[PDB]
Design a protein around this nucleic acid. Structure first.
Ligand SMILES: [Zn+2]
Length: 63
DNA sequence: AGCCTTTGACCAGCG
DNA sequence: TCGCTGGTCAAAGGC
């Protein structure tokens, strides 16, 4: 489960990418007409979670 | 009812 | 040309 960020997301895939221990998850912003997506993947070194966003939101943070 | 995660299949770029 | 592979599709099931 990914960290909260004030936006609403839907998970739409998960893949174990080469050179990673932990699988990577793919989410999309459920705002219709908004196509921001983000990737989420943990890593053991330093207990790290990288969240990578592609695209700027169409709209204010949901109510 | 509607929206979520899970999942293997599908996909397109490229070495 | 054709596999590998990171990214996406969508059916199935659960709440
Ligand atoms: Zn958005």
């Amino acid at each position: 489960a990914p960290a909260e960020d004030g936006y609403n997301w839907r998970k739409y895939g998960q893949k174990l990418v080469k050179g990673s221990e932990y699988p990577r998850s793919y989410y999309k912003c459920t705002n219709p007409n908004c196509q921001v997506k983000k990737k989420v993947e943990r890593s053991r070194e330093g207990h790290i979670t990288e969240i990578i966003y592609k695209g700027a939101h169409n709209h204010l943070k949901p109510l």
